[PDB]
C-alpha cells in the first residue's frame, strides 16, 4: 500500500545514511517520535519539516555545521527538525565509555516511547536507546530489523 | 506588516546570512530564487526536500563533498524546494571566461525564467546574482539584501 511503500522507504533513506556515517565515524543523533508526542524537544530545534533522503540526513551531521550539534527529530515520516536539545539520562547502566549523545538517547527513551539512533563519532558503532536501555554495536541487519519492529 | 511580508523579511534575513558565512569560507553555492515563472521541471531534477528555510539549512546544504552540495538548491517562496537540481547551461559571451559551471547555470536559468539566482564563488567567495541573462559579480552585503528586497 502507499503508506507500506513510504514507511519502506523512509527506512531505506535512513539506514543508508547510518551506513555513511559510521563508516566515516561522523556522530549523529536520530530520534523517530512514536505515540508520545515530542513537540516540546522539536521547538529547541531548527524547523526544518522536510522530506526524508538520505542525503539530507548525511549533510545535516556533517561535522562542524550549523546542523550537526543536537538530535534530529522525525514526526510523520518527515525531518521535523534538527539541532534540538534531549534530556540526558543519569542512568548508571550505560557503557562508561560513552558520551554525550548516548545519554542524550538514553535520555529520551527513558520518558518517552521513541526510538534513536546513535552513530558513536569515536568508533563509528551504531546503537539504538529505546525503554531506558541502550543496543549497542549493532550490524546494518539488526538496525534494520528494530526499524521494521517498530 | 502582514504576516507574508514578515514572512518574506525572515527569508531574506536567512538567504543573506547563508550567503555571507559562506562567501566568508569560499563555500562554493547555487541559490535559485523562483518569481512567476515555475521552475518544476527543474526542481524535480534534484533531490526533494520541500523544508523550511534557515540559514543553517542553507549552509549545511552547501558544503562541500557532501550529498547535496553540487547542483542548484531552489528555493519557491518560503521554502527550501529541494537541492542538487539540475540548470542549463548559458551560452552568453557576457559571462567572465574564468567562471565556472555555478555562474553558467545561473544565468542559463536566468534566461529561461525571471527567477534571482546568487552565486557564490569557491574561488574568490564573490557574490554575483542572475537575472534576466545577466549577471552582475562582486556584490557588497548591501547590494545582495536590496536586490532581494526588490524582488
Ligand atoms: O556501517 C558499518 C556497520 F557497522 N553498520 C551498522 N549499522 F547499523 C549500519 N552499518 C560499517 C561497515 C564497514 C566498516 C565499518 C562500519
Ligand atoms: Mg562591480
Redesign the pocket.
Given at each position: 500500500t502507499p503508506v507500506e511503500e513510504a514507511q519502506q522507504k523512509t527506512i531505506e533513506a535512513i539506514?543508508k545514511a547510518?551506513?555513511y556515517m559510521?563508516?566515516r565515524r561522523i556522530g549523529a543523533l536520530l530520534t523517530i517520535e512514536r505515540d508520545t508526542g515530542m513537540g516540546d524537544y522539536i521547538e529547541t530545534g531548527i524547523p526544518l519539516n522536510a522530506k526524508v533522503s538520505s542525503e539530507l540526513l548525511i549533510n545535516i551531521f556533517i561535522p562542524n555545521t550549523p546542523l550537526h550539534d543536537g538530535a534530529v527529530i522525525m514526526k510523520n515520516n518527515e525531518i521535523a527538525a534538527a539541532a534540538c536539545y534531549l534530556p540526558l539520562s543519569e542512568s548508571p547502566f550505560i557503557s562508561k565509555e560513552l558520551g554525550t549523545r548516548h545519554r542524550a538517547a538514553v535520555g529520551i527513551s527513558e520518558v518517552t516511547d521513541s526510538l534513536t539512533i546513535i552513530v558513536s563519532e569515536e568508533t563509528?558503532?551504531?546503537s539504538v536507546a529505546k525503554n531506558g536501555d541502550l543496543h549497542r554495536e549493532?550490524?546494518?541487519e539488526?538496525?534494520k530489523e528494530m526499524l521494521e519492529a517498530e
Open positions: 539506514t547510518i551506513n559510521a563508516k563509528g558503532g551504531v549493532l550490524t546494518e539488526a538496525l
